[PDB]
Amino acid sequence: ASEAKQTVHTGNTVLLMIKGKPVGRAQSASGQREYGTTGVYEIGSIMPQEHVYLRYEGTITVERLRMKKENFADLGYASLGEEILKKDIIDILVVDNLTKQVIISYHGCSANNYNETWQTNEIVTEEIEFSYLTASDKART
Amino acid sequence: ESITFKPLRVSSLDQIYESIDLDELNENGIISIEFVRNRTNTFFRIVDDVTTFNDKSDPVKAEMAVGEANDFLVSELKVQLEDQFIGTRTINTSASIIKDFIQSYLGRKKRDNEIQDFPAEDVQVIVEGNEARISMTVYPIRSFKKISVSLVYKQQ
Amino acid sequence: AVEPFPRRPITRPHASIEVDTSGIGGSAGSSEKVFCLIGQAEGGEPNTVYELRNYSQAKRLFRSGELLDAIELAWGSNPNYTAGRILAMRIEDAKPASAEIGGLKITSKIYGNVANNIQVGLEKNTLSDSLRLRVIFQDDRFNEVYDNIGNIFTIKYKGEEANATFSVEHDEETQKASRLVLKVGDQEVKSYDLTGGAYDYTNAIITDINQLPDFEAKLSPFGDKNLESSKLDKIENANIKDKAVYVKAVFGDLEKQTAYNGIVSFEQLNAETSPIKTIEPFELTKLKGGTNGEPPATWADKLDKFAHEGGYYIVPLSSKQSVHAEVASFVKERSDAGEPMRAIVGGGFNESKEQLFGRQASLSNPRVSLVANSGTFVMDDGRKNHVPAYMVAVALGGLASGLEIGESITFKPLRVSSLDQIYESIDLDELNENGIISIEFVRNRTNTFFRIVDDVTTFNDKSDPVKAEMAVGEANDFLVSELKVQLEDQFIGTRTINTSASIIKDFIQSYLGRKKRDNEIQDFPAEDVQVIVEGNEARISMTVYPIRSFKKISVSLVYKQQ
Amino acid sequence: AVEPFPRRPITRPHASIEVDTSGIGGSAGSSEKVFCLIGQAEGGEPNTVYELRNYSQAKRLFRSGELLDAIELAWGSNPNYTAGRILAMRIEDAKPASAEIGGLKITSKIYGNVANNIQVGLEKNTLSDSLRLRVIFQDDRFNEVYDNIGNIFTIKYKGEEANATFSVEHDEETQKASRLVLKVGDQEVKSYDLTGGAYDYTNAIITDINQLPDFEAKLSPFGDKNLESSKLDKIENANIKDKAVYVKAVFGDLEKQTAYNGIVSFEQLNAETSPIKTIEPFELTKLKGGTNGEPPATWADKLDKFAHEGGYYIVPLSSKQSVHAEVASFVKERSDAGEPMRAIVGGGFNESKEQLFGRQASLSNPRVSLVANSGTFVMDDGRKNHVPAYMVAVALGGLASGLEIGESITFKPLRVSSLDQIYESIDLDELNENGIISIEFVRNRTNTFFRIVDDVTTFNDKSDPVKAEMAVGEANDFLVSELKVQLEDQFIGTRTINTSASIIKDFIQSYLGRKKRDNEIQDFPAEDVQVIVEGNEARISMTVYPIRSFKKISVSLVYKQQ
């Protein structure tokens, strides 16, 4: 129940950072990976003798409520026009709120999809999809 | 890459030295130019890149290749660190985030192949107030210099 | 304990990078418990315990010695089981070095034979009628310089009158000089007693003098000088109408600035009621008299210093049998007092198993374990050191510190490069059966391990696991100690109006149930608890089953046709 | 193993090409298991185990002996299968040669008679106030000469005074240099006290002396001459004005220039405090005392060194029964201690069967195997090396250490040019059934080989293939070693409460399941596995089928005239 004693990361305990700033009004974040695993089969038997890894695919999703200031478009972390070619890679960190310790990091993030919605009575929702080169979980120990 | 063993335009030289003279001269920490001829093909070559500093125990001090690459590396790393960290609040910064940044910087550096692989785990940090201290371990770029061969005739 | 070193003040925002042969080294990891060590060590205050969170602090304060090597073993033995926080105290009763030249008694913040390599000197700055200081600590190459020392502000009298005189009086009872009077043409304007009250600081005096239409007191820009008024120097009849009259606090300026020097302390020499020996320039001269002293014959006083510190594990870096007895007696006292502890001991090189039994015969105590093996370790900078057993004891202590309460050190690997002797299977059995903890060697296809065969204390009987296995006893120790301290807070500490025996029983059962939910304890009897209350006292009795580890496996193979 | 002797680092980048008649006669092949040997060897030092990888290193390390002949076959016994990594150790307790003349003691790291042929002498060089040293070694054709030995940078004086005097003074309890002084006329100018600091380094002293306006310091022309001031010879009143003064350290400079040169090592003679005697020139002198000792009746102390070193297929290079008795007991203990061993032996130039039956009667341990034949091998040099049986055993051992785990040495070829004995079919049958290995000659269609008939060991009972034959035992030995390590890691360091019989059973099936996929074993009856658990103890039984091998066939012929 207490802040420190809870063995499980609630959404409250977690903080999301980009380039030395927190991301305000964040709502969701998902990370998916595929090692390109395959099975080896031969004439001798149907059962797969071994499994091997072929290709590494890594994507992370983020959703956000469009603030009147400090949006991804305003902040330059995301781009709309041809300016994207002038945007370098980005690194994302997911952080423990209590001590600012690192939980997991995404390296070499680059954008894939950018989505935006407006509606009569809902809050403006901003979504973006990032593809990255590697993901590492170090500096914890 | 080093200047070692690469050719030169020079038509002729005043002096040519013996192998022992080159060895003594090279070990003293002095650059020399050697003449090579084989199969009617003549060049003048840089024997080595060692500097005036004496101690071979410090390659970063003795040789140009280590120092030159090291000089640019620190210049690039220093600029990035100053921009990322200095103009930010201490309260949101900590040791762990610093450690991740370094690994990412060394990660992208390795992909470019400007360095050999590095022991990511060796990196560790301390933080106190407005001050922080960092230590890291990295391996250099080597270079193959000498070889040895032998011959045997078995009459068949 | 004391975390000795606070921040260094900084001057500029910058990033600096410098190649080196060595790095910052290890670091203390998160830990439930604390690890205490005593040993030969250069640097630091004798008979004082220091807490260390990083190897950098250990280098910075425990400048060298086998103790510092022990810390490296504690954190470097296993990255997964890195040792926790550290408490350290040097056995050697080192002395400071001292220099008494130029009206100043100069002493070293450093204690030991190194302290004589400190050089300090004063110089005369003819440019501003001021003294100058330089401090060089050659071994650490630490160079410091101060200039314009003593001069705070200048006074000019601007009027046409014949003579303006500045005077400061002296008190001989306390040796202070606490008056400052401006007189012009045998007439006085104001007098400032420098004994607090109206003119405690020189700032108010400067404000007071500046208000006078015929005078101006102007601040010296060379160094912050807002010293208290009482620190002004003895001054007698200085002509204010002249080009410049200086107001001086030579010791006061020294006292403030020199406090920030990392090597030196300053005292003002009283002549040998004797007046003050004048502070004057002198040659940069070595300090003298700093030594390491000798270790005490008995370490009991040192061990008593660690009482009420919470360090569960303590390791003396020695092989002396008497010293081991002192620790065992000390640990016995603390355990009964309410502060459980464990001691890890190991002596000499390749000591005979019979001598090990001799130590066992002399000493049989569950609160201590005796390590037999001696070996060599590869450490920072590539140096490999061949060391006695008590350095191996640190590795066991550092390992056990990192491990959780419920997990034993049994069978875990160790990084030690090699061992003096390779015990056989029978040799190992004799040691373990006789309450001796040892190290075992095994070889893979292309790998080699050094393993801790089992947890055993000097206590021999196998009947009771808590007595034999320190891991089991440790689990009981932390369970009870954590329970009681919590219980003290709720009922004794916190104001409780009423309490019944049954209420205590429920609270105990609530506590135990939580531990099971955290997997700290496997099982226990719920109905076995007993509570009795008698006036102002209560008796509590309960039982919990110790955890059992996996020891033996026996295998047989049968070959057959088809 | 004791590390192989090093080599000088790179001097210059180049391509060194040379010609030798013999060159490399062999080298190591990729392997996991290791091959061990002991025998007579001229080189190295005794009671030491060395790691061999190439023939040239062993040849240089062991200049002569039966060892290299045994080694050469092992790396060339078969084109495909080679022994791989080899451990070797010389039996006899050889000693180095020595000489003690002119304040110096000369000793050779090489132990043996040949060391006496080393000639070392000192010559006086008046042109530079120095000594020359020459070494001659006929057998290795190793010669070394050095000039201007014992000279350190000179000093000269420039002032007016009648004299400038220099001295070097020594510590009375160590004979080390403690102080050296420069003096001008009747007055002293400077001195350097050898207590650390810049006073240790002649490089700094050159700078410090040059800084003096009246003194000059200049270095020798023959390469570097830097040396610590501690090594400087005692000098008194060296006149600096008229001529430059030479700084002397004959011992220090000699050691540096003669560095490496392991054929010769130097010790300074303590004159009969035993003062450091002055070094004197002396004519070239043959060393003495270089000897090769006798082999003791018991090599058990020698054999124990190989324990805990991961060896396999040991081969002792001797025929006498006493050695074979020791090793048979030794390997037995190795099997007990979880590091199983196997051995291959020979009986000399037996060339007869009846003696073998007596020997086989003596030895019937399953862990040892005997070979009967003796023959001639052709070396790289081409010598018709006629050798006893126990050299042929090495070829078998060299082949076996290269062959894979699950295959036998049976029926495979051999390099041997010729044999002393060829047997009948009945003789082979009787010999084979007795439990003795033999080599047979086969010729058909003008194609001749020598083959290993079988792999049976000295153990008699055919009813136990795991005991009788190498293929079952070798594979079985590795299997248990791998399984044992995994089980210890998985289970021992875990709590009993979460462990049970069923999980143990599943683990075994998975281990045997993945083993079967690798095809290292035949299929196994998974159901047969069953377990019992009680407290900290568990018992396991399993059934497995071995790897078979097809040996004999039978054919018949019929002609039907059409």
Residues 80-139 of A with CB under 8 A from B: 89, 91, 93, 95, 99-102, 105, 107-108, 134, 136, 138-139
**How far is A98 from A95, CA to CA, in rounded Å?**
9
Beta bridge partners of C99: C106
| Residue C465: CB atoms within 10 Å | 18
D195 contacts chain B (CB < 8 A): no
Q: Which residues pair with D247 in a beta bridge?
A: D152
D164 beta partners: D184
As a three-state string, the secondary structure of C75-120 is HHCCCCCCCCEEEEEECCCCCEEEEEECCEEEEEEEECHHHHHEEE
A102–B107: do the CB atoms touch at under 8 Å?
Answer: no
**Which chains share 3+ C-beta pairs under 8 angstroms with A?**
B, C
**Chain B residues touching residue A89 (CB < 8 angstroms):** 108
| Cβ-based contacts of B120 with chain A (< 8 Å) | 138
For C15, the closest of B70, B78, B137 (CB atoms) is B78
Is the CB of residue C13 less than 8 Å away from at least one CB of chain B?
Answer: yes
Q: Do D90 and D103 contact (CB within 8 A), yes or no? A: no
CB neighbourhood size of D170 (10 A): 19
Cα–Cα distance between C341 and C367 in angstroms, integer? 7
Q: Are C337 and C329 in contact (CB under 8 A)?
A: no
Query: Pick from D307, D488, D543: which is nearest to C558 by CB?
Result: D543
Q: Compute chain A's Rg from CA coordinates.
A: 19
Quoted resolution (Å): 4.3
CA angle C474, C478, C479 (to 5 degrees): 110
| Integer Cα distance of C458 and C365 in angstroms | 5
Which residues of chain B neighbour C30 with C-beta distances below 8 Å? none
Bridge-based pairing state of the strands C313-316 and C342-346 = parallel
What is residue D150's three-state secondary structure? coil
Q: How far apart are CA C146 and CA C133, in angstroms?
A: 5
Most C-contacting residue of B74, B80, B81 (CB-CB within 10 A), to test interface: B74
Q: Give Cα D554 distance to the centre of its chain.
A: 49
Specify whether the CB–CB gap between C46 and C111 falls below 8 A: yes
How far from the centroid of its chain's Cα atoms is residue D401's Cα? 18
Spatial strand order of the sheet with D368-371 comes to D50-52, D86-90, D35-39, D312-316, D343-346, D368-371
Q: How far is CA D365 from the centre of its chain?
A: 29
CA distances from D310 to D305, D306, D327 (A): 11, 8, 16
What experiment produced this structure?
Answer: cryo-EM
Which residues in B lie closer than 8 A to residue C11 (C-beta atoms)? none
User: Given CB atoms, is C23 within the 8 Å cutoff of chain B?
Assistant: yes
Q: Which residues of chain D have a CB within 8 Å of the CB of C561?
A: 545
Q: Which amino acid, one-letter code, is at D438?
A: S
Sheet holding C130-137, edge to edge: C142-149, C130-137, C118-125, C282-286
Q: What is the DSSP letter of C21?
A: S
DSSP code of D198? Answer: G
d(CA D49, CA D330): 17
3-state secondary structure (DSSP) of residue B121: helix
User: If you compute the radius of gyration of chain B from its CA atoms, what whole number of angstroms results?
Assistant: 23
Q: Hey, is C61 helix, strand or coil?
A: helix
Task: Name the DSSP class of D337.
Answer: T
CB-closest option in C547, C555, C562 to D540: C555
**Chain A contact set for B108 (CB, 8 A):** 89, 107-108
Distance CA C437, CA C428 (A): 9
Q: How far is D529 from chain C (nearest CA, A)?
A: 10
A 10 A CB-CB count for B79 gives 11
Residue from D333, D463, D492 to probe the interface with C (highest C Cβ count within 10 Å): D492
For an interface test with D, the pick among C116, C520, C550 (most D C-beta atoms closer than 10 Å) comes out as: C550
Say which residues have a Cβ less than 8 Å from residue C457's Cβ, sequence separation at least 6: C365, C366, C367, C368, C369, C435, C467, C468, C469, C470, C473
